[PDB]
Structure prediction request, 968 residues.
Amino acid sequence: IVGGQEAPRSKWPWQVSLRVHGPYWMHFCGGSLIHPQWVLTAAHCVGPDVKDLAALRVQLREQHLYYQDQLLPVSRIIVHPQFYTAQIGADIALLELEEPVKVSSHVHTVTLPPASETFPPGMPCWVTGWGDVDNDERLPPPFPLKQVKVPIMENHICDAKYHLGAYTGDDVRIVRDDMLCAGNTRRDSCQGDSGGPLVCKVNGTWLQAGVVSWGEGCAQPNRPGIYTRVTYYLDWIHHYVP
Amino acid sequence: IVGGQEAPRSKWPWQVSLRVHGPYWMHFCGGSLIHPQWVLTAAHCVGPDVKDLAALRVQLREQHLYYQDQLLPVSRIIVHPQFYTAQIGADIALLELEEPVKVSSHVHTVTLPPASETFPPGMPCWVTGWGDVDNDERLPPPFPLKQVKVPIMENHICDAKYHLGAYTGDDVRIVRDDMLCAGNTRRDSCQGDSGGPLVCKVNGTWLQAGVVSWGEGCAQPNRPGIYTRVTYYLDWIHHYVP
Amino acid sequence: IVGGQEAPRSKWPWQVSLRVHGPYWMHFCGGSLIHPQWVLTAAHCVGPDVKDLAALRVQLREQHLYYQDQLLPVSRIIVHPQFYTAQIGADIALLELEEPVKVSSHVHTVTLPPASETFPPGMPCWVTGWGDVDNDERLPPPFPLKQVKVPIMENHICDAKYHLGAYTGDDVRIVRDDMLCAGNTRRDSCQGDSGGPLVCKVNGTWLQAGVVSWGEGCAQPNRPGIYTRVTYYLDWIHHYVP
Amino acid sequence: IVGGQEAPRSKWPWQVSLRVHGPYWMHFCGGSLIHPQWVLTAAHCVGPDVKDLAALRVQLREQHLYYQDQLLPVSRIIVHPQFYTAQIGADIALLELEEPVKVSSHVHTVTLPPASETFPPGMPCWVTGWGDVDNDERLPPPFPLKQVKVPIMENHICDAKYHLGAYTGDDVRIVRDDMLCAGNTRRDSCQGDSGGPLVCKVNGTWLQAGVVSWGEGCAQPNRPGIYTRVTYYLDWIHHYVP
Ligand SMILES: CCCOc1sc(C(=O)N2[C@@H]3CC[C@H]2C[C@H](c2cc(CN)ccc2F)C3)c(C)c1Br
Ligand SMILES: CCCOc1sc(C(=O)N2[C@@H]3CC[C@H]2C[C@H](c2cc(CN)ccc2F)C3)c(C)c1Br
Ligand SMILES: CCCOc1sc(C(=O)N2[C@@H]3CC[C@H]2C[C@H](c2cc(CN)ccc2F)C3)c(C)c1Br
Ligand SMILES: CCCOc1sc(C(=O)N2[C@@H]3CC[C@H]2C[C@H](c2cc(CN)ccc2F)C3)c(C)c1Br
Prediction:
């Protein structure tokens, strides 16, 4: 997370840490609890190549990474069949927990938005995670959960910004329809925040608008953060998630 | 170049080295001389981001990289407008030299194939460059120009190989129509060979089948090297080069 | 710390973490609280070149590094005048805290050994710190305070052991009189433990026998860990410490 | 080599490159031909630990490293018995070639100085090698043999300069009598030049004043380059070299 601050303990109960087995259970990606037995993440975190379920663990809401570790095993890894790279699209994945979680006030699910829900500029939106604080600058220990309020940019305006300083033809789409744009040179998501949630307060309720996907660096000029549009993959999510 | 050996001095007169200004004029990509004043390379070498022409030089055929440097300036960089990433496609670019080179027996152009030209499966072809010898294994000094014989893998067969051990749906194409496959676990192109030529001897004439583009690692199981199909972009090439 | 285990919360109340200002207050060396206002460390940690007082902080006993931080400023950095390198000797330094610490059962001082105290082999001795777990293998998060029981080796035996597979003449002393030897191929101190204490239980009382100084790698054959002999610099310590 | 320029082909015929086996015969240290069958170098290059003769090769004067390789085998490695560390001193070693070198105008021996020569400040002295061009800045390809005119400093002044900005006592010797000082913030030897020669023109004859040994970084304020004083070890060299 570029800019912003450390998140208070009561905020973002849905935020999860994805862990890989090595010298320790290392955080590689973020995620969000969308159902007591289901975690929503980015496909690039757990794909496109087949991963070993034994080498993966899910860590629920934690104020400081690695401190209060209570790792949960994964039953199923479901990656969108249209996924290959974050730039092509379909950067969405589902993780089925071995057993459903005990929902508390400190740890509970995030509400998915309706199919017709469009997130326009000016809407209060926040992105969370334990990712890099800047380009090539990792989150320092004790690795606190960071939060940043990001401004939403319209897809066509964001696509136009991505063409500035690029050879890519103006008619050639960089920011696709299954993507969402948010952030600026001071506020953005980064490497390590991938798979994590982008929540927006719509009529007094928090709705996950996006999934941290990609971008040309972090908080760089004319390069806002790109997220997988949750509304676009609602039919695919509901096929596995009740 | 993975496998093979040091190329003899008389072989591959079209092979060029692309140089970027830093502590020294360092090799970042390969290429091929297609016209005395034009160089064919991969778009990812010089894009999608707009490059500074003063910070770029072209080095003609050299037995040992950096030894007899005769750096040539560039007047134009023409990156295909459909290019953004090597996986999406259109990984092709043209470099116009400031002055046309004096064509000789040691340094001369490569013949481009006709519009209908097909490269059969199992056909022996050659890939050249000063790239890495293996995954995370740089070409050791005095950096000789390397060559390797690579077998052609048909597009549908190669696409199926990329789906082996991947979540990506069988109906979702990884190896695209504007792409070409070549190599195995012992013979392949690698990081640094990008932009370089893939040559096939057809009826006693060397034709450039592909431009080194991408691949999931170098000489990895079920992951052959991906090349930009020259035949697919002949009209775009002929629009700029006479 | 090579080998051993995570130290219990009730053990080593004198253990100190030395912090340097950078992207965060990074641990660079260990230390021991010898007086409520004085910290004993290695000279190579804070020298031989003059350090900025404002860029240094002292962290008292932590079960997990960086998690429960309460950084203390330093008022004086006293490095032994005979110090240049750890191999030459006099690898000892004192850090005066700006204010004295409120002593408790969990955080208290270590007793310095008497002037004529020798530490022969077989004695129950432990070395503590948050250093590397092996050669080029960092202590993984949540960075637990580690301990290891290390066997003491006689100075002349350890000195002759350092000459094994070395061109250095047998008459040329490697392990000097101001040094102490401890550890083996399974039990040792490493990079990051430097400045930390080597404590021995003598007559039911814990005495600081040494200060982590140097060694040819960590837990390598015929290369035990080298410590600064505390008894040798007792007069120098007592000149500043009450 | 920090500062200066690329050496002309006719200059420094005694300069040699020391090679170690791995992915290629990599340069690790410099040296000098003092006798047709003997090479003078620094002890830290080949010690204090015993090295395998088969993994070591000697390369005679080369304008560009690796380009015209004619690797020569070594029969004996003689490291000074007083050596352990460059800072302690005796950083001198002799390498006996398997066969004597066929001496020519391009490749010949350097004259050792008489015992009486102290090399005072103001002598025209040069240091040569293929080492780093600055701190953490490696010599760029085609790796040309570099040279730099370095100002000689008197031992007591160089020792006092090393105490500036250091805790080390003014009466505690840093620069020993078996050492020689040369260089400034623009002209110095660096990592990779170690073992190489420091030559001074005395009575129209090039005499090797020193062997590149150590220093606190390269071209750093009040930290000139430290060389092993050849005259000090003249008796030791003559015990092996005819
Ligand atoms: C022109 C190439 C467009 O495709 C991109 S952007 C891009 C990039 O710059 N990235 C850095 C590091 C990996 C990749 C995506 C990273 C990233 C950016 C964001 C948005 N700031 C969020 C999460 C995240 F992981 C930032 C890469 C590697 C590729 Br391929
Ligand atoms: C699932 C991701 C598919 O897209 C790929 S493959 C891929 C990869 O493994 N590469 C390594 C290093 C960069 C990228 C392409 C590299 C490469 C392979 C080849 C084929 N052996 C030729 C040239 C070349 F530069 C080999 C990357 C970074 C990305 Br994004
Ligand atoms: C010529 C060998 C003697 O001088 C030495 S040993 C030595 C070494 O191998 N070290 C590694 C990394 C730095 C230095 C000291 C390190 C070390 C070893 C120990 C004992 N295992 C304790 C603390 C500690 F920092 C282990 C170095 C850099 C030097 Br100079
Ligand atoms: C205060 C510690 C004194 O002893 C030194 S100086 C010193 C240092 O800064 N060095 C850099 C890298 C290794 C070591 C010696 C290096 C060096 C300097 C020079 C002179 N500029 C020539 C050759 C050479 F290898 C420059 C080290 C590692 C040690 Br241990």
